[PDB]
Amino acid sequence: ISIALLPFLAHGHISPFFELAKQLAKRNCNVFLCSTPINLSSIKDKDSSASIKLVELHRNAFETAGPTFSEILKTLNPDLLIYDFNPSWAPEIASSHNIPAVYFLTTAAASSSIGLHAFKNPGEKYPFPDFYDNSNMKLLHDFIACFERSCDIILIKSFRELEGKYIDLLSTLSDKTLVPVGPLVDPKTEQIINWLDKRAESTVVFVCFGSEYFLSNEELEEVAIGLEISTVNFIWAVFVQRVGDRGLVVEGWAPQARILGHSSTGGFVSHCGWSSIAESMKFGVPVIAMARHLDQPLNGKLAAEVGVGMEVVRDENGKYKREGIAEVIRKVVVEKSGEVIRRKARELSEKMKEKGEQEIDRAVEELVQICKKKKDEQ
Domains of the chain: 2-184+355-373 (3.40.50.2000), 190-354 (3.40.50.2000)
- Do 34 and 97 meet the contact criterion of CB atoms below 8 Å apart? no
Q: Classify burial at 141, counting beta carbons within 10 Å of its beta carbon; exposed 0-12, middle 13-18, buried 19 or more.
A: exposed
Nearest to 232 by CA among 334, 130, 163, 340: 334
The DSSP call for residue 323 is H
Task: Report CA-CA distances (Å) from 311 to 19, 262, 291, 329.
Answer: 29, 23, 8, 10
Instruction: List the chain gaps (C–N > 2.5 A) by preceding residue.
Output: 58, 135, 185, 238
Question: Residue 59, SS3?
Answer: coil
State the method.
X-ray
Helices marked H in the chain — which ranges? 11-25, 38-43, 66-76, 89-95, 109-120, 140-148, 160-174, 190-197, 219-228, 256-260, 274-282, 296-306, 322-329, 339-354, 358-373
* Residues labelled as active-site residues: 13, 84
Contacts from 191-199 at CB under 8 Å and sequence distance 24+? Answer: 191/248, 192/235, 192/248, 192/250, 192/254, 192/255, 192/258, 192/259, 193/255, 193/258, 193/262, 195/235, 195/248, 196/235, 196/259, 196/262, 196/264, 196/265, 197/262, 197/264, 199/233, 199/246, 199/264
Query: For the chain, how long is the longest CA-to-CA vector?
Result: 74
Angle in degrees, CA 330, 290, 272, rounded to 5: 115
Angle in degrees, CA 299, 302, 304, rounded to 5: 115
Q: Give CA–CA dist 204/261, Å, rounded.
A: 12
User: Which residues are 367's β-sheet partners?
Assistant: none
Q: Rounded to the nearest 5°, which phi and psi values hold at 265?
A: -90, 130
First-to-final CA distance of the chain: 16
| Distinct helix (H) and strand (E) counts, the chain | 15, 13
Task: Quickly count: other Cβ atoms within 10 Å of residue 93's Cβ.
Answer: 24
| 3-class SS shares of the chain: helix, strand, coil, % to 5 | 45, 15, 40
Task: Report CA-CA distances (Å) from 239 to 175, 195, 220, 226, 230.
Answer: 53, 18, 11, 10, 12
Task: Quickly count: other Cβ atoms within 10 Å of residue 314's Cβ.
Answer: 12
- Do 38 and 55 meet the contact criterion of CB atoms below 8 Å apart? yes
Q: Give CA–CA dist 40/15, Å, rounded.
A: 10
Which H or E element spans position 102?
strand 101-105
Resolution in A: 2.9
Residues 6+ apart with CB under 8 A from 173: 113, 116, 117, 120, 121
